[PDB]
Design a protein around this motif. Structure first.
Motif, PDB file in Angstrom:
ATOM      1  N   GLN A   1      77.580   0.639 -12.006  1.00 41.78           N
ATOM      2  CA  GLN A   1      77.612  -0.815 -11.912  1.00 41.78           C
ATOM      3  C   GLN A   1      77.047  -1.285 -10.579  1.00 41.78           C
ATOM      4  O   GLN A   1      76.295  -2.257 -10.526  1.00 41.78           O
ATOM      5  N   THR A   2      77.422  -0.591  -9.506  1.00 35.71           N
ATOM      6  CA  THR A   2      76.922  -0.927  -8.181  1.00 35.71           C
ATOM      7  C   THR A   2      75.441  -0.574  -8.076  1.00 35.71           C
ATOM      8  O   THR A   2      75.018   0.477  -8.567  1.00 35.71           O
ATOM      9  N   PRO A   3      74.629  -1.428  -7.448  1.00 36.10           N
ATOM     10  CA  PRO A   3      73.191  -1.148  -7.348  1.00 36.10           C
ATOM     11  C   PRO A   3      72.849  -0.018  -6.391  1.00 36.10           C
ATOM     12  O   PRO A   3      73.727   0.576  -5.761  1.00 36.10           O
ATOM     13  N   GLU A   4      71.557   0.284  -6.281  1.00 32.37           N
ATOM     14  CA  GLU A   4      71.071   1.424  -5.505  1.00 32.37           C
ATOM     15  C   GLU A   4      69.844   0.958  -4.727  1.00 32.37           C
ATOM     16  O   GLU A   4      68.744   0.902  -5.276  1.00 32.37           O
ATOM     17  N   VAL A   5      70.032   0.617  -3.462  1.00 35.24           N
ATOM     18  CA  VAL A   5      68.952   0.053  -2.671  1.00 35.24           C
ATOM     19  C   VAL A   5      68.256   1.156  -1.885  1.00 35.24           C
ATOM     20  O   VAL A   5      68.788   2.249  -1.684  1.00 35.24           O
ATOM     21  N   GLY A   6      67.036   0.864  -1.448  1.00 38.98           N
ATOM     22  CA  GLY A   6      66.258   1.785  -0.644  1.00 38.98           C
ATOM     23  C   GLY A   6      66.113   1.319   0.789  1.00 38.98           C
ATOM     24  O   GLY A   6      65.526   0.266   1.042  1.00 38.98           O
ATOM     25  N   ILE A   7      66.631   2.093   1.736  1.00 35.79           N
ATOM     26  CA  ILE A   7      66.682   1.707   3.141  1.00 35.79           C
ATOM     27  C   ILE A   7      65.541   2.384   3.885  1.00 35.79           C
ATOM     28  O   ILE A   7      65.072   3.456   3.482  1.00 35.79           O
ATOM     29  N   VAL A   8      65.046   1.731   4.922  1.00 40.98           N
ATOM     30  CA  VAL A   8      64.360   2.431   5.998  1.00 40.98           C
ATOM     31  C   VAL A   8      65.277   2.382   7.213  1.00 40.98           C
ATOM     32  O   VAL A   8      66.022   1.414   7.409  1.00 40.98           O
ATOM     33  N   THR A   9      65.303   3.467   7.978  1.00 42.48           N
ATOM     34  CA  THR A   9      66.135   3.557   9.173  1.00 42.48           C
ATOM     35  C   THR A   9      65.240   3.206  10.352  1.00 42.48           C
ATOM     36  O   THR A   9      64.517   4.059  10.872  1.00 42.48           O
ATOM     37  N   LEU A  10      65.270   1.942  10.759  1.00 41.66           N
ATOM     38  CA  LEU A  10      64.399   1.490  11.831  1.00 41.66           C
ATOM     39  C   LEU A  10      65.027   1.780  13.186  1.00 41.66           C
ATOM     40  O   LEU A  10      66.204   1.499  13.423  1.00 41.66           O
ATOM     41  N   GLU A  11      64.228   2.371  14.067  1.00 39.93           N
ATOM     42  CA  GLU A  11      64.678   2.820  15.371  1.00 39.93           C
ATOM     43  C   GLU A  11      63.777   2.225  16.441  1.00 39.93           C
ATOM     44  O   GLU A  11      62.569   2.074  16.243  1.00 39.93           O
ATOM     45  N   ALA A  12      64.384   1.872  17.570  1.00 37.11           N
ATOM     46  CA  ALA A  12      63.668   1.180  18.630  1.00 37.11           C
ATOM     47  C   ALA A  12      62.735   2.143  19.350  1.00 37.11           C
ATOM     48  O   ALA A  12      63.166   3.188  19.845  1.00 37.11           O
ATOM     49  N   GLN A  13      61.458   1.785  19.407  1.00 41.46           N
ATOM     50  CA  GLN A  13      60.451   2.600  20.066  1.00 41.46           C
ATOM     51  C   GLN A  13      59.401   1.682  20.666  1.00 41.46           C
ATOM     52  O   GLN A  13      59.086   0.636  20.095  1.00 41.46           O
ATOM     53  N   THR A  14      58.878   2.073  21.826  1.00 38.61           N
ATOM     54  CA  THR A  14      58.001   1.204  22.594  1.00 38.61           C
ATOM     55  C   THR A  14      56.612   1.123  21.975  1.00 38.61           C
ATOM     56  O   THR A  14      56.079   2.109  21.458  1.00 38.61           O
ATOM     57  N   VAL A  15      56.048  -0.083  21.985  1.00 37.37           N
ATOM     58  CA  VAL A  15      54.696  -0.321  21.501  1.00 37.37           C
ATOM     59  C   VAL A  15      53.949  -1.160  22.522  1.00 37.37           C
ATOM     60  O   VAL A  15      54.537  -1.963  23.252  1.00 37.37           O
TER      61      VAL A  15
END
Lengths: 40, 51
Positions: free
Chosen positions: A1-15
């Protein structure tokens, strides 16, 4: 019943960020050879 | 070669601690201001008018 989402794990990095810009090259020290004397 | 009284500038030296801001108002707006300030329907500002 509960949905299934797709995550990206965003991490802080210098640009950096740099932008192209137009323009025209000019000569360094151009001398317009022009006389100081009337004659032939 | 550089000649006397030359029309072409060699370099431009400007300083900007204040900056003049040239602002163009249409003359019909100034004319309706002169028509409305004379009547009582628009009072002159006074001490705050310059800002």
């Amino acid at each position: 019943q509960t949905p299934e989402v797709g995550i990206v794990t965003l991490e802080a990095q210098t640009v950096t960020l740099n932008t192209e810009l137009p323009g025209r090259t000019n000569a360094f020290r151009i001398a317009e050879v022009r006389p100081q004397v009337n004659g032939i | 070669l550089v000649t006397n009284g030359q029309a072409n500038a060699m370099a431009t030296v400007q300083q900007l601690d204040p900056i003049y801001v040239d602002v163009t108002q249409p003359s019909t707006a100034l004319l309706r201001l002169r028509r409305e300030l004379a009547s009582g329907q628009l009072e002159r500002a006074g001490d705050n008018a310059a800002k």
